[PDB]
Amino acid sequence: SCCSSEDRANVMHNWDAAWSAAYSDRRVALAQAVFASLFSRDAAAQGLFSGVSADNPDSADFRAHCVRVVNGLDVAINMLNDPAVLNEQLAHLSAQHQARAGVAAAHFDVMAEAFAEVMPQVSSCFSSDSWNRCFARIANGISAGL
Amino acid sequence: SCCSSEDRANVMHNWDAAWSAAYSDRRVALAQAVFASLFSRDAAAQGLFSGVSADNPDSADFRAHCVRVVNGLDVAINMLNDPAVLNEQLAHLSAQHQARAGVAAAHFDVMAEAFAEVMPQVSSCFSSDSWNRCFARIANGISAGL
Amino acid sequence: ECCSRGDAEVVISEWDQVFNAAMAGSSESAVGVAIFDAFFASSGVSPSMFPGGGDSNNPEFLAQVSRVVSGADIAINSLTNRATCDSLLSHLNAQHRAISGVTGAAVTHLSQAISSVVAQVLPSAHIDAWEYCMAYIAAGIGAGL
Amino acid sequence: ECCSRGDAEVVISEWDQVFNAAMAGSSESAVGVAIFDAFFASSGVSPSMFPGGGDSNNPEFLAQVSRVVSGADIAINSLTNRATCDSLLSHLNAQHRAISGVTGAAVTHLSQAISSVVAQVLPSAHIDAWEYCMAYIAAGIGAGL
Amino acid sequence: ECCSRGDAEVVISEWDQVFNAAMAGSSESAVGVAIFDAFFASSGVSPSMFPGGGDSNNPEFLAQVSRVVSGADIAINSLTNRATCDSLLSHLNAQHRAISGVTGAAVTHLSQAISSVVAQVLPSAHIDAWEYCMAYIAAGIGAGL
Amino acid sequence: VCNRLEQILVKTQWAQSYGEAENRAAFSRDLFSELFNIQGSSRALFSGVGVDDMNSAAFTAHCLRVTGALNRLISQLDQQATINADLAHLAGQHASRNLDASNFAAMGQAVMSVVPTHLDCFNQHAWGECYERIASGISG
Amino acid sequence: VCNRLEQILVKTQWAQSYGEAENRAAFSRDLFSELFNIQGSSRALFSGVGVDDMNSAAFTAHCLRVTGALNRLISQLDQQATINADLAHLAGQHASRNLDASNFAAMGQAVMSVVPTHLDCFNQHAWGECYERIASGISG
Amino acid sequence: VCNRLEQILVKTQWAQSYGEAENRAAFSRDLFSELFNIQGSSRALFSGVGVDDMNSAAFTAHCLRVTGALNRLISQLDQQATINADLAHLAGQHASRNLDASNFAAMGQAVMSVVPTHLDCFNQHAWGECYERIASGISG
Amino acid sequence: DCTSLNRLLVKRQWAEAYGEGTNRELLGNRIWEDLFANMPDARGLFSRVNGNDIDSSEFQAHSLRVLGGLDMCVASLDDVPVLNALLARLNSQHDSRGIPAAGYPAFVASAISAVRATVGARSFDNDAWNSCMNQIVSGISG
Amino acid sequence: DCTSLNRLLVKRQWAEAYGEGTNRELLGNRIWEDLFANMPDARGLFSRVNGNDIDSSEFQAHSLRVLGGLDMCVASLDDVPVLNALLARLNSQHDSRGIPAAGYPAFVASAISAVRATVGARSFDNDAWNSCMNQIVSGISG
Ligand code: HEM
Ligand code: HEM
Ligand code: HEM
Ligand code: HEM
Ligand code: HEM
Ligand code: HEM
Ligand code: HEM
Ligand code: HEM
Ligand code: HEM
Ligand code: HEM
């Protein structure tokens, strides 16, 4: 359950590949796929994103939301080596989700298995264990007090 | 009599050890020991430091004076590689002792053998010759015109 | 995972960092009391339970503090080698079992106090790995308490 | 001399620089159209001569652009080995010989367009070596046209 | 001590030596039966207890022999990592617990048979380290049998 | 399926990757890593061998038996009667566990996604032909 | 066939092998080397490009255009309309030459026997899925 | 005994050997190794801490507490009141075990036969003076 | 203005510039130490994330967050529609703060400045960066 | 304010910062080039040790001397009594010069700034440094 050093390094690698700092087109493919399942396994959840053209994944309004998330995760994944900072970020990200009527702790588990399904399809030789160990470390922080 | 390159390097080493840039507690032990003998071999000299609670070595007023000296010597010892600068310093340190009614050239010889007695007890494998060669180089500059 | 080779390595590093070639061997006390003060605050435990009952300027409590920081150092510097660390911890365990007033819930309090102070002194402190390991050490000492 | 081992090396470098590990495999199109637009301007040639007659947003012309940038890449990345480069170029030559509307004077126009755009995108571009080599490539393709 | 890092290393070496880049993947059988024959002799056990009851030329017993040499190889090649070796052995243990006719006193017989044959084939065989380790492996498999 | 010659390539290439490899425990663990990443539905199919943590001594023990079995078979590829028997033994060791044809088909993808990376040369076909030969034997 | 995600793996892995590779001329030549070794019946199918000698400037020129084409397509995998067009162009450039379905199927075996060796990671499926996507486009 | 200055040399030299040292567990174990080799009569005096095998986790655990204690004292050499207290604590932790004056005298020989080897410089006297200061404190 | 080719050059350079892990902090501080220099009167807007102690966790998170957003825009520069939406949110996230008009211009100067020091002034295209950095700010400040 | 733990962190960092030999000059100039920048009107106080030619022997001695004193204070931070006495002397050594009140604040900013660049902003504790650097100045300027 502890996202170790060898874990973050290993996860930062998985996420290093399958990622493009130049073009957002890929970040979106990843995000969309994540959401694809997310909703597919919790229709009710899709409602939380009415504030975004969720009904139309292929819509700017939505793909824009993808970037934010994909970016938010990437921003946290990179702090994974500098805990002190990460905390502030997760703390932040947290309050933002609290500010969202609905989204509760549980939801992050669906989102958890959501990524857990998409990653192996984007990054080569992805190491599930390390990702599951650290994706929690992060998610827990956001869903905390939520 | 010439404090050579191999000498200063060697002395800077001796003084590198037996020294703490973090805590003054040691600098004082060293200083006190130096003064211990100094006076012990020239009671009359102790008078020159009436301006400091010399009568009570273990007194703030005094240990404070130790730091100044121990520091002054350390400041000169580090210039030992940059002669031009050193001169300015010794010149300075000099004028400060001239400004002190009493202290005369001779006194620096007692102070000389004073350190010469304490160092081997603070720094391991201390090289007397190099220290005597360079301690002069410095002392001569301060006691000059004094 | 829970405090792995790397975590430990960093801990042992950052710890030997708080106690580098300039600080260690001078004020483990300043750090030590800082630990306790932070301990008492969180644990709520009564300082009037250790040698000299706190009193930062009590010859007994000091020696006491020293012996605590030491123990912590012995264990920390051995996180890389599991086998022997368990032993070291068990020994500590036994020592505390024989002291009416040591709750497992408190052992971790004292353990978290070390981490916290380390971070205060060493801003770089990998507060994630530290807790990961100090958790392990807190388990061995307060095991069953 | 004319586009020597070093020139080529730098060209192939700076080219693989415009198409590094971040850009290549995403917008050879953005670069590609940029090439053409710059081409049409200088050559004066009629865009209404290629698949989809220009129209940057024409599925055909795009594929067309892609195939052009590709050819250029195949040739560039082979400037170090003369023997095989000549072959590659001759093949291109043949392909254009069979297209009523390709003047040697234009081939160089398209070739100079690549260099120019490379420089715009990659300010570092050794515009001296590029022309030295793009001259060679422009000769093989428009040879006899 | 009992089959330490070095012992294992040599064992795993000499074993991978009997099965080098020329022999392994050809006649583990020739070696395998040799093992059994030597087994039956010492253990006294009845060959009429394994698939095809011995019969060196029995398709079943062969497959059987293969699976035995394999198991041995899996365990040997893991002597360096204790933790996982114990697991591997326990698994084997379980498999034999479920076979009425396997005595701990025999497991070692089979284990000593491997060492012995290894030495016959590989004269260099560090017969001291081998027994030191094959002892360990013989304990995990016949544990409690 | 896995003919006399396709058996050669494979045997040598398995030695070249699995043999030459550093620590089988990693190579072995790496293999199952893929099998899961290419068919997550199977990761739980090993709920017994402590799959929850692949770095466990428990799980690694399993991966070894497989890369070990996978090995004790390739060397027997030339021995029809022998390997058939062994395969029978194995196929039946998988009887209990509910295995579909996508699992084995996934296994092959796992094995053939790992092996090539460790070699300078790797014959796509020859391998598939033999993995088949083995896969079949271990099911039907 | 070659979905949004399977396109990712592939694109990155092609860059990792073909991109990182030393001299494409060797990588390219190596590719056709296999195609022939896994389907000799095709070696003569390139009687034009001087196949008699694969180390020739003539032949190497050809291999490059292919690994080059193979490259100008993978980067266009996300651009449906674009790559479809390009593929059409290519498929028709192969009209003249009598190509059966075993040739393309062989090509894929060639491409997928070369690529993995140059990587640390290589997704069997994802690749086949996309080679298919391309193969089809270049024939029917 | 261990005066202000002799405390300096020692503290720095202990850091230089024990501090700089690689793995204390070895340095620690090495220490007791000598104590036994210079006074075998004591080896059994540690029948509790699993001396039967010095490489044991059990025994190494002990050596560490000592080189650890030995360390928590040298740093307190300047703190008279503090170290006196600590020493008292220790001296009494040795009450039960029947220790003669040859044991401590042997301990010093052990400590001073280990330390110098790890240094470039080592003051014989200064050390003995302080080991004394400590030895006494831990007995009488 | 911010031509496609610029977006290209801007996307590329920013990639190189935008470090990895805590290297982003390197860049991060770079743009901040600057902004807070030429315009000290601006450190007050960050009294919450502790703009006073740039090296603190609060502000470091913050700093990093900023680079995050700024990375979306760059990465989105090709797709105008999504970019708009990205800028819209950012805009509403600065809509509250009493950010001075002359703040964005400054920030842009500090950023374009940082990236330059980071990717090295190897013929740094100031026109491309400014032409594009401005297209960004526009949607946020306005 | 300057908590014991700060003194700890301040003593440590300053150790690392305070170079060896002429490396101190590195730090030395660092704090000076700064001070004389933000406050050029301050270079006049050193017309004697040649504040105009920072690289000269005169000022280099001087610069080094300053770091000397500043090292005593740090090294003495634990023992208040001695520190007072140390600050007293320093104070009487600045008692003459027409040093501007806004001089010490500046100096402290330049020092705390130098040390930071020197020990690297690895989460530099500005509060600890300032809290302590101020405890120092107080006894000197007043
Ligand atoms: C651990 C993974 C997650 C990360 C890093 C993440 C990331 C983000 C970010 C960066 C934003 C935009 C911030 C803003 O402008 O307000 C956001 C918004 C949002 N998130 Fe999350 N999030 C995560 C998981 C979830 C989960 C599990 C749910 C619930 C199913 C959720 C619900 C929302 C909603 C409802 C919005 C606002 C939609 C809108 O109006 O645009 N998030 N998230
Ligand atoms: C070569 C070694 C010496 C060095 C580096 C040294 C160092 C110093 C320093 C740095 C000061 C403080 C400056 C001030 O604030 O005025 C000082 C003061 C003083 N020194 Fe020296 N000194 C040395 C040798 C001597 C000797 C040989 C004597 C005479 C026995 C002496 C007599 C004094 C006196 C009387 C004071 C002033 C005491 C007071 O009122 O605080 N010094 N010295
Ligand atoms: C993080 C875990 C802890 C560490 C590092 C630790 C370690 C130690 C060590 C090394 C000693 C000296 C051994 C000896 O007595 O000979 C000791 C003694 C002692 N400890 Fe702990 N301890 C921890 C937690 C606690 C807690 C939570 C309490 C209870 C409030 C506690 C109270 C005591 C007391 C009362 C003594 C005996 C003092 C004496 O010598 O009379 N300890 N501990
Ligand atoms: C710098 C030199 C040039 C390069 C890199 C180049 C390369 C290529 C390549 C690789 C193709 C695709 C091969 C194929 O058709 O299968 C092509 C086709 C073509 N090129 Fe060029 N070319 C160049 C200059 C020109 C110029 C100056 C013109 C005339 C204005 C031109 C017009 C065409 C046309 C019309 C086609 C056929 C489009 C189709 O597929 O229907 N090219 N060229
Ligand atoms: C050195 C220790 C030994 C090794 C390396 C070993 C290992 C193995 C292995 C790997 C298998 C195949 C697993 C399976 O059934 O799926 C097996 C099965 C078996 N072993 Fe052992 N074994 C050892 C000792 C013995 C001894 C001493 C006996 C009894 C005389 C024995 C008799 C059997 C039998 C009867 C089977 C089952 C054959 C079947 O598949 O029907 N083993 N052993
Ligand atoms: C053709 C390749 C395969 C080989 C050589 C192989 C090898 C093995 C071996 C040797 C064992 C351990 C048996 C023992 O010694 O008790 C085993 C067990 C097992 N295998 Fe396979 N296997 C293969 C295919 C598969 C596939 C395709 C799956 C499913 C994805 C699978 C599922 C299992 C399971 C669930 C167990 C039982 C372990 C447990 O949970 O206790 N195997 N296999
Ligand atoms: C899907 C993979 C393939 C790609 C991307 C590809 C690529 C190419 C390209 C770019 C050319 C040169 C066209 C030109 O510029 O004039 C070419 C020609 C050719 N290709 Fe393919 N090709 C593929 C499949 C195949 C297969 C499977 C075969 C047969 C084994 C084949 C047979 C040929 C032949 C015979 C030529 C004509 C060269 C000549 O003899 O003059 N190709 N191909
Ligand atoms: C001056 C050096 C010495 C130091 C610093 C020292 C240190 C220690 C320490 C810290 C412990 C463990 C106490 C605990 O935490 O429970 C211990 C135990 C012990 N010491 Fe010493 N010691 C010294 C001298 C000696 C000598 C000279 C001997 C005999 C040769 C000795 C015999 C023992 C024994 C037998 C134990 C009890 C361990 C057991 O058997 O359970 N010590 N010592
Ligand atoms: C184009 C450049 C800029 C980008 C990419 C940007 C983006 C951001 C981001 C990502 C946030 C965090 C939003 C959230 O999670 O709520 C933020 C907050 C903030 N920004 Fe900006 N920003 C830019 C320029 C500026 C300027 C010009 C100023 C003023 C000097 C400024 C001042 C602030 C303030 C005061 C906050 C809120 C601090 C807080 O979190 O309490 N920004 N910005
Ligand atoms: C806390 C920080 C400071 C420390 C540690 C310090 C300490 C010193 C030292 C060691 C001396 C030499 C004393 C002597 O040997 O007579 C000195 C001189 C001097 N200091 Fe400072 N100082 C500090 C800040 C300042 C400030 C804020 C200013 C004004 C901008 C200043 C201006 C001077 C001047 C004008 C001299 C005399 C130059 C000369 O030698 O002719 N100091 N200081």
UniProtKB/Swiss-Prot annotation, chains A, B:
Gene Ontology terms: cellular component: extracellular region; hemoglobin complex
Keywords: Disulfide bond, Heme, Iron, Metal-binding, Oxygen transport, Secreted, Signal, Transport
Major location category of this protein: secreted
Binding locations of hydrogen sulfide: 66
Record: residues binding heme b: 97
Domain Globin span(s) in chain numbering: 2-146
Compartments (UniProt record): Secreted
Pfam families referenced in this protein's UniProt entry, alphabetically: Globin
Molecular function in Gene Ontology: heme binding; iron ion binding; oxygen binding; oxygen carrier activity
Positions of disulphide bridges: 3-134
Origin: domain of life: Eukaryota
Cytoplasm recorded as keyword: no
Protein family (similarity comment): Belongs to the globin family.
Subunit structure: The 400 kDa hemoglobin consists of a spherical 24-mer arranged as a double layer of dome-shaped dodecamers. Each dodecamer is composed of the 3-fold trimer of the tetramer A1-A2-B1-B2 having one intra-tetramer (A1-B2) disulfide bond and one inter-tetramer (B1-B2) disulfide bond per tetramer.
Function: The extracellular giant hemoglobin is able to bind and transport oxygen and hydrosulfide simultaneously and reversibly at two different sites.
Protein name as annotated: Extracellular giant hemoglobin major globin subunit B2
Lineage per the UniProt record: Eukaryota, Metazoa, Spiralia, Lophotrochozoa, Annelida
UniProtKB/Swiss-Prot annotation, chains C, D, E:
Pfam family membership, one: Globin
GO molecular function, one term: oxygen carrier activity
Cysteine disulfide links: 3-133
Domain called Globin: residue spans: 2-145
UniProt keywords, alphabetically: Disulfide bond, Heme, Iron, Metal-binding, Oxygen transport, Secreted, Signal, Transport
CDD domains, alphabetized: Mb-like
Record: residues binding heme b: 96
Intracellular or extracellular location(s): Secreted
GO cellular component terms listed in the entry, alphabetical order: extracellular region; hemoglobin complex
Subunit structure: The 400 kDa hemoglobin consists of a spherical 24-mer arranged as a double layer of dome-shaped dodecamers. Each dodecamer is composed of the 3-fold trimer of the tetramer A1-A2-B1-B2 having one intra-tetramer (A1-B2) disulfide bond and one inter-tetramer (B1-B2) disulfide bond per tetramer.
Function: The extracellular giant hemoglobin is able to bind and transport oxygen and sulfide simultaneously and reversibly at two different sites.
Homology family: Belongs to the globin family.
Official protein name in the record: Extracellular giant hemoglobin major globin subunit B1
Source organism of this protein record: Oligobrachia mashikoi
This protein's encoding gene: ghbB1
From Swiss-Prot, chains F, G, H:
PROSITE patterns per record: GLOBIN
CC annotations in GO: extracellular region; hemoglobin complex
Pfam families: Globin (PF00042)
Location within or outside the cell: Secreted
Alphabetical list of InterPro entries matching this protein: Globin, Globin-like_sf, Globin/Proto, Haemoglobin_extracell, Mb-like_M
Keywords, ordered alphabetically: Disulfide bond, Heme, Iron, Metal-binding, Oxygen transport, Secreted, Signal, Transport
Globin domain span: 1-140
Sequence positions that bind hydrogen sulfide: 63
Cysteine-cysteine disulfides: 2-130
Main location as per UniProt: secreted
Function as written in the Swiss-Prot or TrEMBL entry: The extracellular giant hemoglobin is able to bind and transport oxygen and hydrosulfide simultaneously and reversibly at two different sites.
Family: Belongs to the globin family.
Oligomeric form and interacting partners: The 400 kDa hemoglobin consists of a spherical 24-mer arranged as a double layer of dome-shaped dodecamers. Each dodecamer is composed of the 3-fold trimer of the tetramer A1-A2-B1-B2 having one intra-tetramer (A1-B2) disulfide bond and one inter-tetramer (B1-B2) disulfide bond per tetramer.
Protein name: Extracellular giant hemoglobin major globin subunit A1
UniProt source species: Oligobrachia mashikoi
Encoding gene per record: ghbA1
Swiss-Prot record, chains I, J:
Record-stated family: Belongs to the globin family.
Subcellular location: Secreted
Principal subcellular localisation of the protein: secreted
Binding-site residues, hydrogen sulfide: 73
Disulfide bonds: 2-132
Top-rank taxon: Eukaryota
Keyword field: Disulfide bond, Heme, Iron, Metal-binding, Oxygen transport, Secreted, Signal, Transport
Main function: The extracellular giant hemoglobin is able to bind and transport oxygen and hydrosulfide simultaneously and reversibly at two different sites.
Gene3D superfamilies: Globins
GO cellular component: extracellular region; hemoglobin complex
Annotated protein name in UniProt: Extracellular giant hemoglobin major globin subunit A2
GO molecular function: heme binding; iron ion binding; oxygen binding; oxygen carrier activity
Domain Globin: residue ranges: 1-142
Any one Pfam family match given in the protein's UniProt record, by short name: Globin
Residues that, per the record, bind heme b: 94
Known partners and oligomeric status: The 400 kDa hemoglobin consists of a spherical 24-mer arranged as a double layer of dome-shaped dodecamers. Each dodecamer is composed of the 3-fold trimer of the tetramer A1-A2-B1-B2 having one intra-tetramer (A1-B2) disulfide bond and one inter-tetramer (B1-B2) disulfide bond per tetramer.
